[PDB]
Enzyme design. Structure first.
Site, mmCIF file in Angstrom:
data_model
loop_
_atom_site.group_PDB
_atom_site.id
_atom_site.type_symbol
_atom_site.label_atom_id
_atom_site.label_comp_id
_atom_site.label_asym_id
_atom_site.label_seq_id
_atom_site.Cartn_x
_atom_site.Cartn_y
_atom_site.Cartn_z
ATOM 1 N N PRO C 130 63.539 35.751 22.715
ATOM 2 C CA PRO C 130 62.890 35.771 21.398
ATOM 3 C C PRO C 130 61.673 36.679 21.377
ATOM 4 O O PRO C 130 61.243 37.125 20.311
ATOM 5 C CB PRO C 130 62.517 34.304 21.152
ATOM 6 N N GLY C 131 61.116 36.964 22.553
ATOM 7 C CA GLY C 131 59.985 37.856 22.671
ATOM 8 C C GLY C 131 58.629 37.241 22.422
ATOM 9 O O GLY C 131 57.632 37.972 22.421
ATOM 10 N N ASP C 151 66.260 41.530 29.360
ATOM 11 C CA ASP C 151 67.210 40.589 28.789
ATOM 12 C C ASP C 151 68.604 41.167 28.954
ATOM 13 O O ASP C 151 68.829 42.346 28.664
ATOM 14 C CB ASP C 151 66.910 40.298 27.311
ATOM 15 N N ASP C 178 70.664 42.849 34.384
ATOM 16 C CA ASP C 178 70.787 41.558 35.043
ATOM 17 C C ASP C 178 69.630 41.407 36.016
ATOM 18 O O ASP C 178 69.417 42.266 36.877
ATOM 19 C CB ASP C 178 72.122 41.437 35.775
ATOM 20 N N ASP C 195 62.039 32.796 32.512
ATOM 21 C CA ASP C 195 62.521 31.714 31.661
ATOM 22 C C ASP C 195 64.040 31.740 31.788
ATOM 23 O O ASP C 195 64.729 32.397 31.008
ATOM 24 C CB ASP C 195 62.069 31.894 30.213
ATOM 25 N N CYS C 252 63.909 25.315 30.169
ATOM 26 C CA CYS C 252 63.987 24.518 28.946
ATOM 27 C C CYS C 252 64.913 23.324 29.116
ATOM 28 O O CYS C 252 65.583 22.917 28.164
ATOM 29 C CB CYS C 252 64.453 25.381 27.777
#
Lengths: 158, 55, 324, 305, 177
Positions: C130-131, C151, C178, C195, C252
């Site tokens: 999402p940045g 990403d 990757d 993340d 997450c």
RNA sequence: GACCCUGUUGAGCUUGACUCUAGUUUGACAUUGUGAAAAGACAUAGGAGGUGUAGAAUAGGUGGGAGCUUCGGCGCCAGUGAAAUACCACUACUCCUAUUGUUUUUUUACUUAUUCAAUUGAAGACAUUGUCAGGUGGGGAGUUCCUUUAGUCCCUCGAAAUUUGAGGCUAGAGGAGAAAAGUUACCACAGGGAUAACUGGCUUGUGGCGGCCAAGCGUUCAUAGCGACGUCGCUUUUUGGAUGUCGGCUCUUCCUAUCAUACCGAAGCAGAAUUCGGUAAGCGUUGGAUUGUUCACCCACUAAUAGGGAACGUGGACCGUCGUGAGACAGGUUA
């Protein structure tokens, strides 16, 4: 059995929405009708007179598809979808418009015509796929003429 | 009425009215069962003695 | 009994039989019920203030002037601003279009303040889909240094480039790599950030597919992929620097295979990593032992975040130090 | 706050003046010691409430919106110098005329916004002197009462849930004395049947109220939903806490048996006792009954502050 | 990450200078001693510091996505276009500025040309077609465009008359989401 | 007019070859040392631990084992647990301490390196330098395999309390060269092509989709199949605002799809007041608030203050000039 399966879906929606309703900032962005009226102040117009599906309410469009304006009253976010197995019709949301065979242009704006394939949320059905997984999006062909009659009708391609 | 405002032919306007008048028709036809109840409680309410608790 | 509890919970909440059993285990019974309320319940909406173009008070005054009901959230953040009601859509405000503020979640805040990014420092982000994290890190170095945005999907990259260049970042390069291959490409950073792709049990409100579409097979390959993701983070950072540089591990998910097991595998395979106090103001310590297996007691310094205690998404934060 | 029905609102105002305030009758021999204001909604309700109290015998002055310039001075003069006991304002006549120190405030119609209630009770119980404020709540006006709870942040009690509820700090709802309400609504119906002029004022204020019902700002959904539960709850029809503990006992020994009459469900409607008889059997089959863990420091709440 | 040639260099600075007042601060050596250099990737050009440009040489050319701040795009006919990505530097040292009212500020965000009834205050020395950069009261950069008519002629049109053209506006960040 | 096409311009989309290399970059190793102060790591020798849940419980773990047994405490058992306590038998991590050491850093200096002035002073172990192992390379020099899918579940590297993931191998299908190319039911501009134009036994009161049932007809028969009326599922349910140019008034005439007035049929229609329907156009047929204007709603009057028809009754249009990321013109003449 068709009433029983429709009741289980409708009861499941009821308790989630009633007991677990929580106040969240959610407002609708203004339409593209006043957006174009502001732009025109800033028959040259081109306005789509066919039923559409958009998705996210307040977005800017690409400059290719920016003279086209789709009115608020010609938009549908939910379709009546029949499942040939278990013989049930329910209301499930439209996720995206995949292909309109009448016009590849109409596919891009998401014009809902006859024999147009859409993606629908099949979460409420809970059909079990392979490897014990619950489906979330299926093909559905529109089998009515939604410009002539207001309801959008479809059959699952299962 | 929003659908009719953007319509483009007499066939389209004809089919849109028939949908609306037809959809209101099938809503009332589903309402058949409570309408018989409210007709019967209306007859018996009008055929009820007048009692005034104050006097 | 327990078996009646599992069948009743899977029926009324609609979870899979497996993932309900795993989530019931890590909680005491009444604590599990309060957790199942919150993670299905939608979360509050939070705003990150761009420090570059504006600051907390004058942005707050501006949005109330446009009718937005705000409240400074917590003593944790000098950067966060909660929203309660808004006549105008949040993305419609001209402050948004200039990049005065960005939509985020609370869990996107805390890895960045877990890191301590300084000026003229080379930093990294293996997943910046999402940045929001990348724009937060650049807010701390005050437009200096260099961020390597990464990403593996080109579709998310368009939203990255749109979000970065609106916010006025001017110091980030974005590559579609990757991140397992990434230390071979460059290596030698100060403060790397990860993340990882995760199971997503920490946030079910945004992604309700994890209720059922997450099974035994998915719980083997996905923590397997975090391991190669995480070993690359040490093998890319610098053992020494003029300003000391640290890794941050952020997932997450609330699962125990995804969290507190990968950090045990990393600190065993690479002995040149230590873990110290992570700098976040609150939290809960990690579990030193879950199912007959012992982790090293450095995980008491790791912080776990839960929907029931805080209105945040389920999260794990841990920071590493490189030695050799 | 007292739970009254729409057909007993006039007699409920006659209870508060007679036995709750113990207002004197006739003209009083710098306001008076009783000095009760009456708030309402429309000028047609002003004309009913004024002219009914003339027939009751109380000294009442009245001001409304489109009242004459000279007519407004003489009636606000009479209230200020203590020549009359009751002042009847809507809300706009209230905010225009100057209000002195006031003792009691009666809300005949519940204010729509909770902040209007503040403005009304702000006119009384100021400067350290004690005051009272009574309101006639209704079933349709109930969700505006639960919205008044959320604004003042006070606790709500239902009838006799507590032995000694705190009037100044907790919201106390309940019902009035049953026996004396049926006497003074008998008087209202007797006067209504007797004099044509008050009867014509009823018909005007009936349709005036029906417009005010339609254009009033609606209550919130959470206040609307929570109103359904307290109606179901057993405290809605119990006796109010002012009337004493001694009034609570013989009310309790009777309504513990009476409440079983109200909770009766007929197993057979009289049309079952034909096609209509098959219809009554058709409904009952279709519609029969269907079978802290957070720290105080940081918890992002969905409510402000 | 091919740096610009001689021909491509005059094109980018030309349309830059039709909007810029001091071209020397953009290419100026700073305190660290490293300057701002112009590269181009996939027929769009980027405005970047030299050091971050140097370590950007590690990524494969048809594999790297974006780098620093995008000045604009090279067109197929060889001309140059500006994007709203160029706005943060463009509004930093602009040469002609237009202020619009709040009821005219959102029209720009929706994408209308500037009309006479929305302007807050003008600047002088504007020819019949001059580039200008638009702000609200708070000098928040909203976009850039060309003046429709001259110092005298733009006002003698109607209050429904377009006074400044739309070229690019901040609302295009709301598209690629 | 829509609509089709051609050229230019934007928005894209797919490409734009291989090998060394300039450039540029990451890591490693050296000149690059001498002290002090610290800190850390491991080298050994000691001391002490441990509370996710539940279990009465500050459960490392592991081998067995059911009183080893001083009191029969502890046991056995029972729970509770992934793992269970008695008993002996083994060995892990952490935190301290020590010296029974190897070190590695950071800071502080100095010059014993290194770089400038000079051709003895300063910086100073920083740079800087070189060699290996890499990344990129639209640049310079030459030169003319991957993609889609499956298997060997065979080999290698990973991961898992025993099953996975990533590479290898094999087999079904594809292939004048950084100067520029093909494509779009796309955009703006310029141009070309096509219908002289709409309805005239049109229109109104009862929705669409899928399923079940279904007389008949049919490729040869109710099963190649078409298929009404109903009923089921969705819309849709268990607590009561919408409208652009127009009008506004009078007057004539007509239709009835009747608001009133006349007449009947039906309704728990007692009376009163009505409601639904039918014959009926003889006779009559409003306002006010609000409005850009009307309708809806609300209020008042009246017997009621119905709706319509009268070829929808009688009183710009380009062109030129300058612009081109957009735009215009006291620009023109003419329709």
């Amino acid at each position: 059995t068709a009433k029983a399966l429709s009741s289980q879906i409708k009861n499941k929606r009821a308790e989630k929405a009633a007991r677990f309703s929580v106040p969240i900032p959610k407002v609708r962005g203004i339409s593209e009708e006043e957006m174009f009226k502001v732009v025109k102040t800033g028959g040259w117009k081109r306005i789509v007179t066919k039923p559409t599906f958009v998705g996210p309410d307040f977005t800017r469009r690409p400059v290719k598809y920016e003279r086209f304006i789709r009115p608020m009253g010609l938009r549908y976010k939910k379709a009546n979808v029949t499942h040939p197995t278990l013989n049930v019709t329910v209301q499930l949301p439209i996720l995206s418009v995949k292909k309109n065979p009448s016009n590849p242009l109409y596919t891009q704006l998401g014009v809902l015509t006859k024999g147009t394939i859409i993606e629908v949320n099949v979460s409420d059905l809970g059909i079990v796929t392979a490897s014990g997984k619950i489906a979330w999006g299926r093909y559905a062909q529109i089998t009515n003429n939604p410009e002539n009659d207001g309801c959008v009708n479809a059959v699952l391609l299962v | 009425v929003r659908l009719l405002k953007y319509a483009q032919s007499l066939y389209q306007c004809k089919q849109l009215k028939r949908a609306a008048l037809g959809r209101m028709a099938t809503l009332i036809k589903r309402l058949k069962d409570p309408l018989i109840y409210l007709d019967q409680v209306r007859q018996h309410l009008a055929r009820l003695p007048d009692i005034n608790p104050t006097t | 009994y327990t078996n009646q509890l599992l069948k009743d919970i899977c029926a009324y909440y609609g979870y899979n039989e497996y993932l309900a059993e795993k989530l019931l285990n890590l909680f005491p019974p009444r604590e599990a019920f309060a957790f199942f309320e919150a993670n299905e319940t939608p979360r509050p909406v939070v705003i990150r203030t761009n420090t570059l173009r504006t600051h907390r008070r004058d942005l707050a005054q501006a949005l109330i002037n446009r009718g937005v009901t705000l409240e400074p959230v917590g003593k944790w953040s000098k950067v966060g601003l909660q929203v309660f009601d808004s006549k105008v859509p949040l993305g419609a405000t001209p402050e948004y279009l200039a990049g005065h503020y960005i939509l985020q979640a609370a869990s996107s805040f805390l890895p960045v303040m877990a890191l301590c990014p300084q000026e003229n420092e080379r930093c990294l982000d293996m997943a910046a889909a999402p940045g929001g994290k990348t724009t937060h890190m650049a807010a701390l170095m005050k437009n200096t240094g260099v961020i390597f945005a990464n990403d593996p999907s080109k579709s998310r990259a368009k939203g990255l480039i749109g979000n970065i260049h609106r916010l006025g970042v001017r110091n980030t390069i974005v590559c579609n790599y990757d991140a397992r291959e990434f230390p071979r490409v460059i290596g030698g950073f100060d403060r790397v950030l990860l993340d990882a792709p995760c199971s997503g049990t920490g946030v079910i409100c945004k992604d309700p597919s994890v209720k059922t579409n997450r099974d035994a097979k998915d719980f083997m390959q996905l923590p397997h992929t975090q391991k190669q993701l995480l070993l690359a983070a040490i093998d890319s950072c610098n053992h020494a620097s003029k300003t000391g540089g640290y890794i941050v591990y952020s997932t997450c998910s609330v699962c125990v295979e995804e969290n507190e097991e990968v950090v045990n595998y990393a600190l065993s395979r690479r002995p040149n990593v230590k873990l110290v106090e992570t700098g976040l103001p609150f939290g809960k310590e990690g579990f030193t032992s879950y199912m007959g297996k012992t982790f090293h007691p450095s995980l008491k310094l790791t912080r776990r975040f839960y929907p029931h205690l805080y209105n945040v998404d389920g999260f794990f934060v841990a920071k590493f130090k490189k030695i050799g | 706050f007292f739970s009254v029905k729409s057909g007993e609102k006039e007699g409920a105002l006659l209870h508060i003046l007679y036995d709750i305030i113990k207002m004197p009758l006739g003209d009083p021999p710098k306001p008076t010691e009783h000095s009760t204001i009456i708030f309402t909604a429309t000028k047609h309700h002003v004309e009913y409430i004024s002219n009914l109290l003339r027939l009751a015998g109380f000294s009442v002055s009245y001001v409304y919106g489109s009242l004459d310039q000279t007519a407004r001075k003489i009636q606000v003069d009479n209230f200020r110098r203590g020549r009359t006991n009751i002042l009847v304002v809507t809300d706009v006549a209230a905010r225009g005329i100057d209000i002195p120190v006031l003792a009691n405030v009666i809300n005949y119609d519940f204010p729509p916004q909770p902040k209007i209630f503040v403005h009304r009770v702000g006119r009384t119980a100021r400067a350290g002197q004690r005051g009272w404020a009574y309101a006639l709540v209704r079933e349709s006006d109930l969700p505006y009462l639960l919205d008044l709870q959320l604004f003042l942040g006070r606790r709500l009690v239902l009838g006799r849930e507590e032995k000694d509820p705190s009037f100044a700090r907790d919201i106390v709802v309940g019902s009035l004395k049953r026996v004396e309400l049926e006497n003074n609504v008998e008087w209202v119906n007797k006067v209504l049947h007797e004099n044509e002029d008050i009867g014509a004022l009823k018909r005007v204020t009936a349709k005036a109220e029906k417009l005010y019902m339609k254009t009033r700002n609606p209550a919130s959904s959470q206040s609307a939903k929570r109103a359904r539960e307290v109606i179901v709850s057993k405290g809605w029809g119990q006796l109010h806490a002012i009337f004493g503990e001694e009034a609570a006992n013989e009310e309790q020994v009777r309504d513990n048996l009476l409440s079983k009459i109200t909770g009766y469900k007929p197993q057979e409607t009289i049309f079952e006792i034909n096609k209509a008889a098959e219809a009554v059997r058709s409904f009952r089959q279709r519609i029969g009954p269907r079978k802290s863990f957070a720290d105080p420091e940081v918890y992002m709440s969905y409510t402000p502050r | 990450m091919r740096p610009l040639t001689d021909q491509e260099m005059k094109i980018v600075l030309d349309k830059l200078a039709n909007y810029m007042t001091d071209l020397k601060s953009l290419i100026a050596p700073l305190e660290d001693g490293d300057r701002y250099v112009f590269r181009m990737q996939k027929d769009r050009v980027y405005y970047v510091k030299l050091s971050i440009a140097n370590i950007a040489t590690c990524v494969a050319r048809d594999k790297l996505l974006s780098l620093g701040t995008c000045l604009g795009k090279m067109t197929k006919s060889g001309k140059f276009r500006l994007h709203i990505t160029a706005l943060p530097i463009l509004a930093q040292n602009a040469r002609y500025k237009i202020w619009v009212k709040d009821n005219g500020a959102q029209p720009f965000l929706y994408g209308s040309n500037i009309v006479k009834a929305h302007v807050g205050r003008w600047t002088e020395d504007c020819p019949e077609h001059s580039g200008c950069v638009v702000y609200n009261m708070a000098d928040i950069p909203l976009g850039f465009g060309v003046t429709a008519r001259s110092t005298a002629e733009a006002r003698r049109l109607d209050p429904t008359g377009i006074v400044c053209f739309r070229q690019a506006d901040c609302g295009e960040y709301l598209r690629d989401e």
